[PDB]
Design a binder for this molecule. Sequence first.
Ligand SMILES: NC(=O)c1ccc[n+]([C@@H]2O[C@H](COP(=O)([O-])OP(=O)(O)OC[C@H]3O[C@@H](n4cnc5c(N)ncnc54)[C@H](OP(=O)(O)O)[C@@H]3O)[C@@H](O)[C@H]2O)c1
Ligand SMILES: CCc1nc(N)nc(N)c1OCCCOc1ccccc1CCC(=O)NS(=O)(=O)N(C)C
Length: 173
Amino acid sequence: HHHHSSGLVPRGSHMVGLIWAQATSGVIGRGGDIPWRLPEDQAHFREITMGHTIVMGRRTWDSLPAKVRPLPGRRNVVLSRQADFMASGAEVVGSLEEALTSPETWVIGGGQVYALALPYATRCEVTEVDIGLPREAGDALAPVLDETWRGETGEWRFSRSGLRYRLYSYHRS
Ligand SMILES: NC(=O)c1ccc[n+]([C@@H]2O[C@H](COP(=O)([O-])OP(=O)(O)OC[C@H]3O[C@@H](n4cnc5c(N)ncnc54)[C@H](OP(=O)(O)O)[C@@H]3O)[C@@H](O)[C@H]2O)c1
Ligand SMILES: CCc1nc(N)nc(N)c1OCCCOc1ccccc1CCC(=O)NS(=O)(=O)N(C)C
């Protein structure tokens, strides 16, 4: 239960990580949008994901502005159960199993997909945003991590955007 894992990824393996930003309450989205824009979090998301495959749910793809998607520098994969859903510039697949063919994959949202992917994941990179944002019916929420996960929490930091935030890194075998 406490064996070490390495950060080096052999090319024959399939490392699955989750990356998300949440308010303390666990909200990650409402009404199809992320309710903040922190430049430190945006930079961090790129630094982690650049050069890898990114997997997202169909609703997260829908929420990206048409002009910015697919996100550059990364293989974009969108999960949909709809046989007629298409994503220009990206691959649409019908299962998580089909999406996880690369050696390093970052699941980048949203609520449903994080839940679905967790069982396969060995890394989570979390940004906590210190914004008063209550959970409302219909909100997209973050996954909750059990005791199989070990992690490190950074100190509270202060965004140029005027909100406090802090970074968590979690891993498991
Ligand atoms: N704060 C953050 O870090 C962050 C990051 C990303 C997104 N978000 C937020 O999350 C919100 C969306 O979350 P969400 O839960 O509503 O939707 P989502 O997870 O982004 O996408 C859900 C869609 O994924 C497809 N899907 C789900 N399970 C599948 C499966 N087993 N196999 C194949 N396809 C599957 C389905 O598409 P079909 O209906 O087409 O079949 C489903 O409707 C966004 O609006 C955004 O606000 C937040
Ligand atoms: C930057 C937002 C973010 N942060 C973390 N730590 N993890 C994530 N997975 C994450 O989501 C990025 C992908 C989803 O992005 C959106 C989803 C729904 C609505 C809007 C967005 C874009 C928000 C944004 O800040 N975009 S951006 O400028 O950073 N960039 C285009 C990706």
